[PDB]
């Protein structure tokens, strides 16, 4: 076979240890999910880090810096995102993994919801990728391995992520990934039906209005790996309708510099037929983790953050924002009347 005896036994034992880890992780998640913190004037607002908004803030008492997500309650209602916003908070407060951003505080006022997270100062993967053009395959593989482990963790908890893209992956001071933006994350045992995500990253079954499952995240991983290694995603067009048509055809073309191992992995992730898509088969995540393209990946060493990162962002101080682009600053206005109190009682 492909593995000799010693290798097969080591791999089997490793896979059983993963099961043991995940069983303990589920116990811990459920305890927090069942038995789950500040106010605005506790923070100085420094600078906007991203919009869609997230601000760098400094906690007055401790001087610690954080990234504070601010959501307008009225906008959340009008856009039908109430449940999604409750999902984001509940999931973030209950999960624990080295590549998932940590939520430190949450609160609300008359106008807004607030989620205060660890500040990840290295910037978005998106910026670095657009600046350099493309990542070499080893560099892309280092990031991809972190996403594979993160999805193995989330999916074991019956959590679907639903918004993988370089814009949502932050680089920390050691060069490792922090996944942010859990607004579409959801506890899903089997199928779910909401049409949501980002066009270039949507699996065909989402676009086709089918009940879909966690395999949409594995499709999105294929899009991410392609984009990291090529510099642009596999289904690329100026308008969403054109993007959707390319996705549903499923025809993928690869740059001539992609290795055959990479193309094979991507054909198995960017697989329209769910009976054939890696991550959706009997062998589960192991079809991905044991693929030839990942043969050099030490999964435990990645988890332990002991692999030397390909890139370490420059950091000049705890509140430095040099790795982030600039955005228009809008003052945070808080109405004298409570808005949408009933809708957000559980937040």
């Amino acid at each position: 076979g492909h593995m000799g005896n010693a290798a097969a036994a080591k791999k089997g034992s490793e896979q059983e240890s993963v099961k043991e880890f995940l069983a303990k992780a589920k116990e811990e998640f459920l305890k927090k999910w069942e038995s789950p913190t500040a106010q605005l004037d506790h923070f100085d607002r420094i600078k906007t880090l991203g919009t869609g908004r997230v601000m760098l803030v400094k906690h007055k008492e401790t001087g610690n810096h954080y990234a504070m997500k601010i959501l307008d309650k009225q906008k959340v209602v009008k856009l039908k995102q109430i449940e999604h916003t409750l999902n984001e908070k509940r999931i973030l407060q209950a999960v624990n993994f080295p590549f998932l951003v940590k939520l430190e505080f949450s609160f609300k006022d008359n106008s807004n919801l607030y989620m205060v997270m660890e500040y990840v100062p290295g910037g978005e993967m998106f910026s670095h990728l657009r600046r350099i053009g493309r990542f070499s395959e080893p560099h892309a593989r280092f990031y991809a391995a972190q996403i594979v482990l993160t999805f193995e963790y989330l999916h074991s908890l019956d959590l679907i992520y639903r918004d993988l893209k370089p814009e949502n992956l932050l680089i920390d001071q050691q060069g490792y990934i922090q996944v942010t933006d859990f607004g579409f994350a959801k506890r899903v045992k089997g199928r779910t039906w909401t049409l949501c995500g980002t066009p270039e990253y949507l699996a065909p079954e989402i676009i086709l209005s089918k009940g879909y499952n966690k395999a949409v995240d594995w499709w999105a991983l294929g899009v991410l790996i392609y984009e990291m290694a090529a510099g642009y995603p596999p289904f690329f067009a100026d308008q969403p309708i054109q993007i959707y048509e390319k996705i549903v055809s499923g025809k993928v073309r690869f740059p001539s510099h992609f290795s055959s191992d990479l193309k094979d992995l991507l054909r198995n992730l960017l697989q329209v037929d769910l009976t054939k898509r890696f991550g959706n088969l009997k062998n589960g995540v192991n079809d991905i983790k044991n693929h030839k393209w990942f043969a050099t990946t030490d999964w435990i060493a990645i988890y332990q953050r002991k692999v030397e990162a390909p890139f370490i962002p420059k950091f000049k101080g705890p509140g430095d924002t040099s790795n982030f682009d600039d955005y228009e600053e809008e003052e945070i206005r808080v109405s004298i009347n409570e808005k949408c109190g009933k809708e957000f009682t559980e937040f």
């Binding site: 998106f126 949501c196 066009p199």
Partner: peptide, 13 residues
């Protein structure tokens, strides 16, 4: 030709 800037999520198609 395609989108090179930051891509926003969609809530419905």
């Amino acid at each position: 030709a395609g989108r090179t800037g930051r891509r926003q999520a969609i809530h419905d198609i």
